[PDB]
Symmetry: none
Subunit: 58 residues, 2 copies
């Protein structure tokens, strides 16, 4: 099982800025964003997945 991580405030600000433009990730955009933030792609994919579900519930 993949470890849970905590995102820094800079990572969360960049993620959210991104989610504000498009709630879905293409492959290239995921790679770029994971590389830029120093995050595993699975963590990024996961954050977007959970954020869609939180905002759908909100």
């Amino acid at each position: 099982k993949r470890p849970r991580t905590a995102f820094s405030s800079e990572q969360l600000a960049r993620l959210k800025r991104e989610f504000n433009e498009n709630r879905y990730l293409t492959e290239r955009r995921r790679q770029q964003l994971s590389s830029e933030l120093g995050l595993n792609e699975a963590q990024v994919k996961g954050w977007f997945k959970n954020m869609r579900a939180k905002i759908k519930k909100s």
Copy 2:
């Protein structure tokens, strides 16, 4: 890669005609009766629905 016998395919097809989606129960029961693993029966149903959509 497994190849299903004509008897298995005949039964799978008749089951598919009656209900194109398996319940857990029916998947278990079908697999037991046919001598197949549940993943193979589940995969057959998945591929059958895809194949049909891919026609129209």
